[PDB]
């Protein structure tokens, strides 16, 4: 992403929506739901907050943090080597290696009995209140505004209170800014493109970046002169 994420609160999006005299029955309560539906459906990794925590494993099981949404990696605490996901169908089950993990809910299922792991995960930025804190980026703000407008105009079209050309134009005006908001948060910066250029340009290829925490991924690959 080129732009930094400045955070502003959720009632920023209702300054914009209640400029429209047909969207004047929106609350924060609908916008709390319709922003979580937008933060999720875009899947933008520059919106979530990267946190790292050390959890300990009791017997192939560990308690996972409460604010987790997506795990980046899980590495051992003593070695530092990272755990691949588990393909095993019979993990902790006994009969009569490269370690792996698996997560469903608030549980992580590991392949090792008694250890400590680090978890690099992602969470939502919150407030003094317990509320989502969204970017200030006016392309993220404008397609979030067109999202809640499209989801409020759909109810007003199903009720028979909005013409077919008004929902058709909002569905078109949003679908441009949804593809645009993808490209704001995805396209690498001038600094992030050197991390790709030093990864894409490798005379001797580096294919074991997952054992480290992708630390040496963007390192420039130097060759000696003879």
């Amino acid at each position: 992403m080129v732009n930094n994420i400045n955070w502003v609160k959720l009632p920023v999006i209702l300054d914009r929506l209640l400029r429209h005299p047909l969207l004047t029955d929106l609350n924060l309560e609908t916008a709390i739901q319709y922003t979580l539906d937008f933060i999720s459906a875009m899947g933008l990794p520059n919106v979530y907050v990267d946190k790292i925590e050390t959890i300990d494993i009791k017997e192939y099981r560990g308690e996972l943090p409460c604010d987790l949404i997506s795990i980046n990696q899980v590495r051992l605490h003593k070695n530092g080597i990272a755990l691949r996901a588990m393909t095993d169908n019979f993990n902790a089950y006994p009969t009569h290696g490269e370690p792996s993990f698996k997560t469903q809910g608030r549980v992580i299922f590991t392949s090792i009995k008694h250890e400590k792991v680090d978890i690099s995960y992602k969470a939502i930025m919150l407030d003094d209140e317990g509320l989502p804190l969204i970017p200030d980026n006016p392309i993220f703000l404008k397609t979030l505004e067109l999202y809640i407008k499209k989801e409020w105009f759909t109810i007003l079209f199903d009720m028979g209170k909005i013409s077919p050309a008004v929902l058709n134009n909002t569905q078109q005006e949003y679908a441009f800014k949804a593809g645009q908001c993808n490209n704001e948060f995805v396209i690498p910066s001038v600094s992030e493109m050197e991390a790709i250029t030093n990864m894409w340009n490798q005379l001797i290829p580096r294919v074991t970046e997952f054992r480290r925490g992708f630390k040496n991924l963007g390192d420039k690959e130097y060759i000696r002169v003879h």
Binding site: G160, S163, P164, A165, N168
Partner: peptide
């Protein structure tokens, strides 16, 4: 005599169907 609360809403509902049809022909 006089009462105009059904001839209103039957003339008003006649006018919804004109404009709901008129906005149904609007194409960008």
């Amino acid at each position: 005599f006089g009462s105009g609360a059904i001839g209103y809403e039957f003339d008003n509902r006649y006018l919804n169907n004109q404009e709901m049809s008129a906005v149904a022909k609007q194409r960008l």
